[PDB]
Amino acid sequence: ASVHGTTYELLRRQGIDTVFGNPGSNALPFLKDFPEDFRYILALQEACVVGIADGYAQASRKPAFINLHSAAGTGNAMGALSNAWNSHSPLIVTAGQQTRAMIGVEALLTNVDAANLPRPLVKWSYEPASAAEVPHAMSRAIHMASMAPQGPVYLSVPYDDWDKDADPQSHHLFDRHVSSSVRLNDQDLDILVKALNSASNPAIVLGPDVDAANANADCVMLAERLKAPVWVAPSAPRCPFPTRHPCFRGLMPAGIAAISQLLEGHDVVLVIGAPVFRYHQYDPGQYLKPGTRLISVTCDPLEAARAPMGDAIVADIGAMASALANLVEESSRQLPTAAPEPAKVDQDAGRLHPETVFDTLNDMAPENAIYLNESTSTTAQMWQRLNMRNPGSYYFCAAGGLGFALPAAIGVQLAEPERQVIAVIGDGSANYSISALWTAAQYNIPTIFVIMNNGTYGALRWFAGVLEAENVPGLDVPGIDFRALAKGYGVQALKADNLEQLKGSLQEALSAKGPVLIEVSTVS
Amino acid sequence: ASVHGTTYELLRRQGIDTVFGNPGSNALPFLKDFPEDFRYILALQEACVVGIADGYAQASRKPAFINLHSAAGTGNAMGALSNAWNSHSPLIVTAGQQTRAMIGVEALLTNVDAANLPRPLVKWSYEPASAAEVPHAMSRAIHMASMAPQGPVYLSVPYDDWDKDADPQSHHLFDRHVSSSVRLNDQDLDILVKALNSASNPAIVLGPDVDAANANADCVMLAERLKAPVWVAPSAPRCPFPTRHPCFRGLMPAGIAAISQLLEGHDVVLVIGAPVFRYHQYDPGQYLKPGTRLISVTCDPLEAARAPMGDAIVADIGAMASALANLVEESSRQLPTAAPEPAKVDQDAGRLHPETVFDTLNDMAPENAIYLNESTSTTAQMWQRLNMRNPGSYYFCAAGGLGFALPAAIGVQLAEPERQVIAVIGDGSANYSISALWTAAQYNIPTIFVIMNNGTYGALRWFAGVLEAENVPGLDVPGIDFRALAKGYGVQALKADNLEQLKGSLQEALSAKGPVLIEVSTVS
Amino acid sequence: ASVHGTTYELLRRQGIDTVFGNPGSNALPFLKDFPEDFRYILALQEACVVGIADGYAQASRKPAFINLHSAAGTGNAMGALSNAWNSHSPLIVTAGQQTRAMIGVEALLTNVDAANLPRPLVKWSYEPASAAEVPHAMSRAIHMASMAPQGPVYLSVPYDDWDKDADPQSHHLFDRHVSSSVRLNDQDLDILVKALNSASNPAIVLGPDVDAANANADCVMLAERLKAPVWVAPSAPRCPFPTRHPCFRGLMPAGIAAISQLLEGHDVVLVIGAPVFRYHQYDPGQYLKPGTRLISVTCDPLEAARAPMGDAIVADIGAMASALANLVEESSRQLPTAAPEPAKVDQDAGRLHPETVFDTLNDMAPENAIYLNESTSTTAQMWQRLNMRNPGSYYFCAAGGLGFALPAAIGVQLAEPERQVIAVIGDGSANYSISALWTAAQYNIPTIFVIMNNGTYGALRWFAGVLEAENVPGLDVPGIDFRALAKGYGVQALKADNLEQLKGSLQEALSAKGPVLIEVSTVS
Numbered sequence A, B, C: 001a002s003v004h005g006t007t008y009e010l011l012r013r014q015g016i017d018t019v020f021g022n023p024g025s026n027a028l029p030f031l032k033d034f035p036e037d038f039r040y041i042l043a044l045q046e047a048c049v050v051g052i053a054d055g056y057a058q059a060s061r062k063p064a065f066i067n068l069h070s071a072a073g074t075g076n077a078m079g080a081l082s083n084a085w086n087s088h089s090p091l092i093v094t095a096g097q098q099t100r101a102m103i104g105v106e107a108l109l110t111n112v113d114a115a116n117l118p119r120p121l122v123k124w125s126y127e128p129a130s131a132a133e134v135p136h137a138m139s140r141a142i143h144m145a146s147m148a149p150q151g152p153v154y155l156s157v158p159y160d161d162w163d164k165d166a167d168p169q170s171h172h173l174f175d176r177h178v179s180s181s182v183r184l185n186d187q188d189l190d191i192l193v194k195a196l197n198s199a200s201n202p203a204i205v206l207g208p209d210v211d212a213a214n215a216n217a218d219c220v221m222l223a224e225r226l227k228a229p230v231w232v233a234p235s236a237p238r239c240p241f242p243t244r245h246p247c248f249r250g251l252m253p254a255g256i257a258a259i260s261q262l263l264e265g266h267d268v269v270l271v272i273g274a275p276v277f278r279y280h281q282y283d284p285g286q287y288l289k290p291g292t293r294l295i296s297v298t299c300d301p302l303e304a305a306r307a308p309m310g311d312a313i314v315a316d317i318g319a320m321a322s323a324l325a326n327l328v329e330e331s332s333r334q335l336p337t338a339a340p341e342p343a344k345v346d347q348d349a350g351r352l353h354p355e356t357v358f359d360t361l362n363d364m365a366p367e368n369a370i371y372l373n374e375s376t377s378t379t380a381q382m383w384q385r386l387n388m389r390n391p392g393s394y395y396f397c398a399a400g401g402l403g404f405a406l407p408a409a410i411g412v413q414l415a416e417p418e419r420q421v422i423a424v425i426g427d428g429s430a431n432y433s434i435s436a437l438w439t440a441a442q443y444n445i446p447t448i449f450v451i452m453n454n455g456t457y458g459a460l461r462w463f464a465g466v467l468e469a470e471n472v473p474g475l476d477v478p479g480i481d482f483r484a485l486a487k488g489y490g491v492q493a494l495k496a497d498n499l500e501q502l503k504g505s506l507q508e509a510l511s512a513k514g515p516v517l518i519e520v521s522t523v524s
């Protein structure tokens, strides 16, 4: 067998059937004879390739496979890999390298010192020392991406390796099963359960690895048993809990003092599937108030090590959430009371308040819609205004790297064809990965893109205002016609300059058979 | 003085007056109070930021200064840095980091292990250990980018450093002059001159560092004295010689055997300002034929070390070219005969042959036009069909990384406001950095963009044909309306479906007062 | 030809004839059939291997070739490489890797991610992608080590590559000549010469790259012409000037304020072949006083970039020193007056003051002796008390890494068989690389080792005293019998408990036919 044939067999046997890519000559011997049971999804720039694959992996809860061209293609994707690292996204990034005979002279298209290129944003990065090693290296990549804590990996493969003979002993790779589905030993688990049962005023904080594990329902059971309020850890990449459940208390503000004050009076705070914590703004103060004990369950040693407070348990989130949900006592305390309806912001017949947009989406979208957020000045209001009952309903760039949501929404929609995806993207953010729109058109992936056009990098103008920072350049982005950009890439385009038109455009978009972009004029 | 004030003083004293950027919160304390004598050039994605800065640096022959946001912004620019590394572009890449107090917890927006991120594509990469070190680190960055061999450098700066007190002793940084304007010692230079004077059939090969040094005219003198044919080294990022000079022999094919055969019978081959060699295709054979001696003059130790053949001298290209041009004898051999006119390809009233496009550009464009090439299947014909008399007239992605020419053409045009820039970009290539168009519109930088629309990644289809590789996915890019994309970003848009319309559109574009995009329907 | 045969041919053709090594199985296919024209020098631990090679390279002014075993052997040598980096020592470090078929499984003896292991202490670090690349990679290593600024490089080679067929086109590697023997262009050199000729009170500071270049005599001429005092840059790894020449002013103290005060009133300070500056102690103040201009000539861009003050010129030290020495005017100012005799410290009939040891060495040793210093509390007195007339007469661990001088003295003695080497090593320092003694015995390399036994890490006790730091552990090293250690490794051993015995032992040692260790009881 060739390295090509053995590698595709390995991929298929390991459940991979899609290649997200932007092609180049170094990968031609890999892409030729492309198997009929695989699908190739082309995107026009590598940030888009990786963002699409990332959304697909996150929504499908399975690894996604990528093929890029050399250093330039890898390089173009490195901002996307920063997000993938923070979201624990299981991405297998392969990159075509020059033929081994041309590497020493540093021929054009050579990826110099290739494995160092994507560091520090990958779990594992490698170039095999021989062609016959390639299937084994691919196996390593699959499992490194897939083991807890999941994350992106990188494999560089010389052009000429594919046609070479594989090791017949590579068949042993095909059906390997590798599990990290582990939970705390019984003795120490019983000690934790007892501490939860004994808490007088517990609280729960949930992060993105809950949603990745589909541990949401187990966390609902846990919260109901403990009669505990539930917060989403700050800077949330995903939504881990039904947002109209009576225990839900919303998104924690990303500040040290803000969080310890929210947690004050809670004697035990159980954090599941989050870093402790993904703070953002400078908000100095106490990590916890006196009287609060924190216990973190994380899938990631690097998270456990860096928490500034609390105990930690490093284990699989799904296995821990299921165990805890089934072992805790039913508390006799009263269930928390649901948060009220948010207020309706007054809206005239002019430009749209963001709040109006989110209220209208919540009203009109299917109850199993999936939202993406890259509208950076409006996140808090979005989280208060969307009723998201189901898992897998929300994604936000986990490293704050713009250019995620537009391509990721395409990958999520590909993963979840029955669930309408609605990406709410600022006018600034929309440009980073604009060319991803083409993939939605070409493959008829019916994502809806809602562009929040306020003319500015509003979150930066706001921050500059908080600082009283004057004379800051580069904060405005006038003069972008998003309907023309959508036409450029073959996506149906609508506008909404007022609420009547927003409702009209949403109605049209929700019934369309293809992707649709709606440019919304929002208050600036 | 603050670190902010001292750093801007250092930059101004070192000749920097422009910041190419995409802003973020980590850089707000750097960008606030932006000096009135500086200009900020915003671009919408970091590949575009760096490509614009790169064109500006390459054309201006001086360092360009960049400011990006954290890991995601840096990451989005890493494909652009792959090109900058290969072109020896003096780029000072700064990236905003989190406040030092929030780095340990890995707050959102922290650039983890920041200095490793852009490796291996930078000459120097650093994060200072204290605020007062920042001006010194900036000095290091300026000089590392600027010393031969020039190249990109990276500096990560925590948010909170800018407002801190600077070291008063940082004034010693302001006026440092650092020179690498060096040439071979007299004794060994005389030995080289004697070998050149004694050669019976010399040839000269020139690379991009000649044009970077503005050594072009000295190389013309050298070639005339030696009566030597002159080739451009393969995969050429720049044009180092007048392309209708009688000695000019064009672009070398990027193959081992092809080059040794071209050089056969030449007893001494003098290579100046190129790697030996930037081969591309697999073309195995002899590095040199018997009877050919190669001598390389390079500004880059890494080039000298990796050449598979020949002697080398590591020195400044400008200083070596001037010395050699003035020291060699005038040979009594006959001057080489100019290459003939290329043939005119037959052209019907339909879609344009690329050859027709280049012939028409050569006819219509000013004699001091500057061309960029990212039309990958047409490079050989472009090089034969454009009379480029002047230095600084040609740029091509030096690492083969697409997404260079569109933004770089904007930066070149900004550097050279009196010289009409014409970027010839394939339909595939145009997408990688499409959003750069906006910068041209916003700042009214009057670049002309000629999109070669053949519907495909033609260079890849061709290669697949050479291989007889079947069933390769992802090679076609139908369904892109480049006039709509140009409208999206505020750039005047024209079409050319036939030669009459090409001439009409070029006439209109050449007289426009702003940037213009022309979508050309080319034979596929 | 095999890779083995081609590689040894390359090494011989490039002037390499000695392999400094500690063997292992991964290197057996390299070491077998060891050519009869090469010599292998075994040392018992890899810090010793590299230190011996380093002394040999520094004294011989040519690259030295090393072979180590995998990661553990490389790792054991990394402290030695820290010194080699700071001394610009041209060291070609090769390390045996596992067979390519066993690398993926990470068999015992695999060097994982090998090229990253010695970073950041090497100029270039690499593992070839195929066997036939190995000769080319070796060529790269030779030239990278040898080009200015010289330094250590690393090459990892899989076991199985050696027996494979080489590329016949690797013959083009054999006789490559690569030069970095460059100096400032004439126009700018004339500007520098004019500034030197116009200075009213110039001073000269010289660093180790002067001695490496054998630029010493040119610097003497330069100093005599300019009538300038000459200092050695701080933390000196080498001696660049005759220490009883009338211009000589000794070793600069390694502090910021101390140096600017020494330079006060000097209008132009010319630094040659040094960093600006290798400060050590915290001594804050002005980098230069008002009225002092500094101009640095350095072979190292990294030095030029990081200087906090002054202009810089990056060029070959030998070529610049020769040019400047021959171009400056003869000043009419008076020649500086020689420094007086240092005082004689009162010495009773008991333990030896270090000053007494150095005075006695200066009296008794041949005028062409070579000294090494790893007696860290006595450096200033050593520099004042040894008349070192000739180049190549002094070495001190350039990164401050102990374990250098004992092995390096063996390599220096091997390089310079006619010059008696005398290594003055503290009792603490002697242990780091103690096993190097064996190599001197086995090869009968007649180095003299003078162990300064004060029972302590005296430089650390002194520093702790300056700080008034109490309760510091680990500063004393009682209970070491250096004569027994010398016997252990087959080296003749002497003691000196008083001055009479010191003179007796030195007399015996100087006339011995083999290496000799003298344990001196020094005042503590």
Ligand SMILES: Cc1ncc(Cn2c(C)c(CCOP(=O)(O)OP(=O)(O)O)sc2=O)c(N)n1
Pocket (backbone or CB within 6 Å): A079, A374, A375, A376, A377, A378, A400, A401, A402, A403, A425, A426, A427, A428, A429, A430, A432, A454, A456, A457, A458, A459, A460, B022, B023, B024, B025, B069, B072, B073, B076
């Ligand atoms: C790749 C990248 N570049 C720059 C930024 C900095 N950035 C920028 C540029 C923001 C403004 C986004 O503007 P928008 O129009 O998408 O949304 P708002 O107007 O609601 O802020 S928010 C933010 O962190 C980033 N996070 N990621």
Ligand SMILES: Cc1ncc(Cn2c(C)c(CCOP(=O)(O)OP(=O)(O)O)sc2=O)c(N)n1
Pocket (backbone or CB within 6 Å): A022, A023, A024, A025, A069, A072, A073, A076, B079, B374, B375, B376, B377, B378, B400, B401, B402, B403, B425, B426, B427, B428, B429, B430, B432, B454, B456, B457, B458, B459, B460
């Ligand atoms: C960033 C990046 N991604 C992918 C490639 C691979 N690539 C691709 C995708 C090419 C086709 C470009 O198509 P085009 O339409 O711009 O021009 P032609 O149709 O004339 O080839 S040529 C080439 O090397 C690359 N070099 N750089």
Ligand SMILES: Cc1ncc(Cn2c(C)c(CCOP(=O)(O)OP(=O)(O)O)sc2=O)c(N)n1
Pocket (backbone or CB within 6 Å): C079, C374, C375, C376, C377, C378, C400, C401, C402, C403, C425, C426, C427, C428, C429, C430, C432, C454, C456, C457, C458, C459, C460
């Ligand atoms: C490898 C290494 N380890 C530790 C040190 C720290 N160190 C130590 C341990 C010194 C004392 C050396 O003691 P000595 O006996 O050799 O000489 P003195 O008694 O004259 O100080 S000086 C110094 O910097 C070092 N520089 N290098």
Ligand SMILES: [Ca+2]
Pocket (backbone or CB within 6 Å): A359, A362, A363
């Ligand atoms: Ca409602």
Ligand SMILES: [Ca+2]
Pocket (backbone or CB within 6 Å): A060, A414, A415, A416, A417
């Ligand atoms: Ca699915």
Ligand SMILES: [Ca+2]
Pocket (backbone or CB within 6 Å): A426, A427, A428, A452, A453, A454, A455, A456, A457, A458
């Ligand atoms: Ca906005």
Ligand SMILES: [Ca+2]
Pocket (backbone or CB within 6 Å): B359, B362, B363
């Ligand atoms: Ca014509």
Ligand SMILES: [Ca+2]
Pocket (backbone or CB within 6 Å): B060, B414, B415, B416, B417
């Ligand atoms: Ca200009």
Ligand SMILES: [Ca+2]
Pocket (backbone or CB within 6 Å): B426, B427, B428, B452, B453, B454, B455, B456, B457, B458
């Ligand atoms: Ca095309």
Ligand SMILES: [Ca+2]
Pocket (backbone or CB within 6 Å): C359, C362, C363
């Ligand atoms: Ca004396």
Ligand SMILES: [Ca+2]
Pocket (backbone or CB within 6 Å): C060, C414, C415, C416, C417
């Ligand atoms: Ca010798």
Ligand SMILES: [Ca+2]
Pocket (backbone or CB within 6 Å): C426, C427, C428, C452, C453, C454, C455, C456, C457, C458
């Ligand atoms: Ca001691």
Ligand SMILES: [Mg+2]
Pocket (backbone or CB within 6 Å): A116, A117, A118, A119, A120, B116, B117, B118, B119, B120
């Ligand atoms: Mg990296």
